[PDB]
């Protein structure tokens, strides 16, 4: 049994394993204290304002406050609720019995006499937009310039989606319990989380591991990287065909091809309309760039047979970067994919012309790599409806029997059963050519023997990690430099 | 209200402050885990054998074991009791519910399959000698060569005295809760504790501070060191008379005098039988060494008037090092102290001839600095009965209105109300002349304005700290080198 939420995990740990809810709440609060100390150093000179709601997030806040008593310069709780859950009441009682001061009125000037704000207003129990007293207070904290530490989730972020519910706390440090929440991973939530620490508060480890949606980590990618046996030859490491480019878009094939080669693929062949095919070997003569005779500079049905022939002697086919999107391309792409009995990595213009019926009838696997504009056009929805919409991505992958790689600052990788989130990268990747590289990487890892899902997982991590290794300002990163950085990213991963 | 024991502190925290006993027990166990990680690094590759008794020490052990499940290579509990306290039963139940394995039979070969032993057999609840199964097991752990971590106190040490109750665990690391116990501080317990960490497990801080017996810390000594105002003159820093030496013991006065000067005293005068007085200025010409005309090389009543005259112009008098111990010395020492209306620091041969009636009738204060042989002769008991006997020291100080500084590897400093334990030093101080230096230091700090208790506290700490700063093997330390190291100890303390 997998478990979508910490709510189910908490309940089981209490009701079935028998851990008192108060023990979990104590472990949560002391983990916030320890995290603060790792981040601020010695706490003894700081004055803390702890903002508590009436739920168990506020209860966690009372634990924090009580544990700082007598050890820091000052502690004050502002209790912002109208009533208290039983564990919140218990820890409120402890805090007062230990000598702690609580007020129920928030005075704007109160921020002046404190150094650190502990945000324990709302956690996973947030429901609906924040207004009123709560909102004014959150807005005052965000204008204050103080150090902000959020308990579980910054108040105002929907922990299931990462959306802001009218307004939300911007934290320097967020301490979350058991596992990261989706709202720490997706934006805008990811941005408001600041530095995220995930604390073990005593849940059984197999329940924590029962979660079906994961952040892609360095350790996970290290274990998936294929082996390089010494006694090998190029065929050991697979062969990729890339069907890409047009008279309009001559550069895309080059970036995709080198993306396959830089991740260790043995042989890469491009099929590109003549004379644009010669661009590729002029820059990188280790590529094979086959000239395709076209009528007007674009792939059409007249090239169907030659592409299928070239596919026979490769392991994987990538298609789409720079193809263009007119009727002749659409007929070619769909007839080709319908007939191709090899794994396919489908990107860019091949997605824009794709008939999703074709995916349903394919026996061989596929990875699709849309950005949200492409995904939107693919399922006929708005960009705002598909962006960071992991449930829709899962549904699409399951219904069409593919892996879907929905690119954004956080990239979602899913086969419909398992969903992985990638958080490596930076804004240098928000630039033409970046996606073309990733397409090559994925096809390359598939050719080397990784499953479509594994190939996609490793590729999105390494593509973002390579961007982070760029030595100058990220806004100056281009795809050609990203390519150069891939082998360093691989070395560092090991 | 002061509180002799953690037992009273625990009870109050539960019954009056309202902290569930299970929350304290969870905080205790997780603190052991964190301490182990600080000491061993990453725990994940280690196999842990946790030895649990049937009391709350064993309960703490169950917390530890449960928190390691799924995170380390292996965990096994050997439960050694016949029944379980309620919190021990609760955490035993949790441990099993989480998948943990318990056995009730200890097999000698079991030590072979583990790397770390967690000793949770007996804590503060130890009563009487350890025998039987318990003893064989403790003896097997001490022969094993494994890493040993003791929960609260190594099993077998009496937490109130530091004595071994037949046999006891020798720990590499002891994690204790709230405050150090007397059995961590006094030997042999101090030796078996290994590295001691004191964990905050959630007691109110003012209860923790209500303890009346303290370890002397660097911070405490820093705050007591007297100020050196720039606009000062030697009189600002006090004047000491040292009455010391004999034809037999010519060196003692020198060590005592320089001990006063090295701690910052302004003027030091010695009174020493002629021609032994000339030894002092031959080595250290900054000393004043007044020649006392004696009949046979020892102080006697014929010197009473001259010593009282010399005392008029000083702040403090130290007496005893190297005086000798015959009848004429006894008459002189007792008549002098009876008449002297200045604070006195009484050491060595002055203690050996002391009539304790004289202390009772003195209006002025006194510090006495015996080693246990001297203390034994002073109260007419055996060395074994007075050694590390802090209750007897307290009773003596209170009954005689003095400060008693009972020297040993751990030195006990008490005025009968407050008792302080010093743990600085090493075996280089187990050598003639060491005590003479300390006597000078104490008189010097008194002359500079510290109370007898404060002077004694600062002096025992700095005397031991200076020994630790010796650059070569400690067994080669001599009193002359200890003197040279005092000003470095002072610098380092600031």
């Amino acid at each position: 049994h997998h478990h979508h939420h910490m709510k189910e995990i908490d309940e089981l740990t209490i009701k079935e394993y028998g851990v008192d809810s108060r023990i979990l709440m104590e472990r949560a609060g002391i983990s916030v204290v320890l995290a603060m100390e790792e981040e601020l150093g010695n706490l003894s000179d700081y004055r803390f304002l702890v903002l508590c709601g009436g739920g168990n997030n506020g209860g966690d806040g009372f634990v924090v406050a009580r544990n700082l008593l007598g050890v820091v310069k000052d502690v004050l709780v502002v209790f912002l609720g109208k009533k208290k859950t039983p564990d919140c009441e218990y820890n409120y009682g402890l805090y007062k019995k230990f000598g702690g001061k609580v007020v129920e009125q928030f005075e704007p000037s109160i921020l002046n006499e404190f150094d650190v704000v502990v945000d324990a207003i709302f956690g996973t129990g947030l429901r609906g937009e924040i207004t009123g007293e709560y909102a004014e207070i959150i807005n005052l904290v965000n204008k204050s310039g103080k150090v902000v530490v959020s308990v579980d989730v910054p108040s105002g972020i929907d922990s299931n989606t990462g959306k802001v519910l009218r307004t939300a706390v911007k934290a320097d440090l967020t301490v979350t319990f058991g596992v990261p929440k989706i709202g720490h991973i997706l934006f805008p939530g990811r941005d408001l989380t600041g530095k995220l620490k995930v604390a073990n508060i005593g849940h059984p480890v197999h329940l924590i591991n029962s979660i079906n949606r994961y952040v892609i980590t360095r350790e996970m990618v290290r274990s998936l990287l294929p082996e390089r046996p010494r006694d090998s030859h190029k065929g050991t490491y697979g062969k990729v065909l890339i069907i890409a480019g047009s008279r309009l878009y001559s550069g895309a094939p080059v970036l995709s091809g080198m993306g396959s080669l830089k991740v260790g693929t043995g042989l890469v062949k491009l099929a590109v309309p003549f004379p644009q095919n010669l661009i590729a070997t002029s820059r990188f003569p280790e590529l094979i760039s086959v000239p395709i005779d076209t009528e007007k500079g674009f792939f059409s049905l007249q090239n169907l047979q030659e592409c299928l022939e070239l596919s026979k002697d490769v392991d994987v086919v990538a298609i789409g970067p720079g193809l263009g999107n007119n009727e002749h391309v659409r007929e070619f792409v769909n007839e080709f994919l319908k007939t191709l009995e090899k794994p396919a990595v489908i990107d860019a213009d091949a997605i824009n012309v794709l008939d999703t019926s074709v995916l349903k009838e394919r026996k061989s696997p596929a990875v699709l790599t849309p950005h949200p504009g492409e995904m939107a056009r693919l399922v006929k929805k708005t960009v705002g409806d598909v962006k960071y919409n992991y449930e829709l991505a899962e549904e699409f992958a399951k219904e069409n029997d593919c892996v879907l790689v929905l690119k954004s600052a956080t990239t979602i990788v899913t086969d419909g059963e398992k969903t992985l989130f990638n958080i490596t990268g930076n804004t240098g990747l928000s630039k033409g050519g970046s996606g073309d590289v990733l397409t090559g990487m994925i096809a390359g890892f598939i050719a080397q023997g990784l499953s479509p899902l594994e190939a996609s997982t490793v590729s999105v991590y390494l593509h973002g990690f390579a961007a982070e290794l760029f030595e100058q300002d990220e806004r100056g990163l281009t795809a050609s430099e990203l390519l150069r950085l891939i082998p360093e990213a691989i070395r560092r991963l090991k | 209200h002061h509180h002799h024991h953690m037992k009273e502190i625990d009870e109050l925290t539960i019954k009056e402050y309202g902290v569930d006993s299970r929350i304290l027990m969870e905080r205790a166990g997780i603190s052991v885990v964190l301490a182990m990680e600080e000491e061993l690094g990453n725990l994940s590759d280690y196999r842990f054998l946790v030895l649990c008794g049937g009391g709350n020490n064993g309960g703490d052990g169950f917390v530890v074991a449960r928190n390691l499940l799924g995170v380390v290579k292996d965990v096994l509990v050997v439960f050694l009791g016949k029944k379980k306290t309620p919190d021990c039963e609760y955490n035993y139940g949790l441990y099993k519910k989480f998948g943990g394995k318990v056995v009730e039979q200890f097999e000698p070969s079991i030590l072979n399959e583990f790397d770390v032993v967690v000793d949770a057999i007996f804590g503060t609840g130890l009563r009487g000698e350890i025998t039987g199964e318990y003893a064989e097991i403790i003896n097997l752990v001490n022969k094993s060569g494994k890493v040993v971590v003791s929960v609260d106190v190594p099993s077998g040490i009496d937490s109130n005295t530091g004595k071994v109750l037949r046999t006891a665990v020798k720990a590499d690391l002891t994690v204790t809760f709230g405050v150090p116990k007397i059995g961590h501080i006094l030997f042999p317990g101090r030796d078996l504790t290994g590295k001691l960490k004191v964990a905050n497990i959630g007691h109110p801080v003012h209860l923790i501070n209500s303890i009346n017996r303290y370890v002397i810390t660097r911070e405490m000594v820093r705050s007591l060191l007297p100020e050196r105002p720039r606009d000062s003159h030697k009189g600002t820093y006090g004047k000491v008379l040292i009455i010391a030496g004999s034809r037999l013991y010519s060196g003692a006065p020198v060590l005592s005098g320089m001990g006063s000067l090295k701690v910052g005293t302004g003027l030091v005068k010695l009174a020493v039988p002629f021609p032994q007085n000339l030894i002092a200025t031959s080595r250290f010409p900054e000393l004043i060494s007044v020649p006392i005309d004696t009949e046979k090389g020892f102080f006697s009543l014929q010197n009473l008037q001259e010593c009282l005259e010399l005392s008029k112009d000083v702040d403090v008098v130290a007496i005893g090092p190297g005086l000798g111990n015959n009848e004429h010395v006894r008459e002189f020492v007792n008549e002098f102290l009876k008449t002297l209306e200045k604070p006195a620091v009484i050491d060595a041969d002055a203690i050996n001839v002391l009539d304790t009636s004289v202390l009772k009738e003195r209006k002025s204060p006194a510090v006495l600095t015996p080693h246990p042989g001297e203390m034994a002769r002073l109260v007419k008991k055996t060395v074994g009965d007075v050694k590390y006997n802090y209750e007897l020291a307290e009773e003596f100080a209170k009954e005689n209105d003095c400060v008693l500084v009972l020297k040993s590897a751990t030195t006990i400093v008490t005025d009968g109300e407050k008792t302080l334990f010093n743990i600085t030093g090493n075996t280089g101080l187990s050598k003639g002349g060491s005590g003479d230096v300390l006597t000078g230091m104490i008189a010097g700090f008194i002359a500079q304005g510290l109370s007898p208790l404060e002077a004694s506290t600062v002096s025992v700490y700095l005397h031991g700290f200076a020994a630790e700063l010796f650059e070569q093997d400690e067994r080669g330390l001599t009193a002359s080198e200890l003197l040279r190291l005092i000003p470095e100890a002072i610098r380092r303390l600031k």
Binding site: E38 | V33, G41, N42
Partner: peptide
């Protein structure tokens, strides 16, 4: 890196 309490 010891990670009993925290995953970064």
């Amino acid at each position: 890196a010891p990670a009993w309490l925290f995953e970064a």
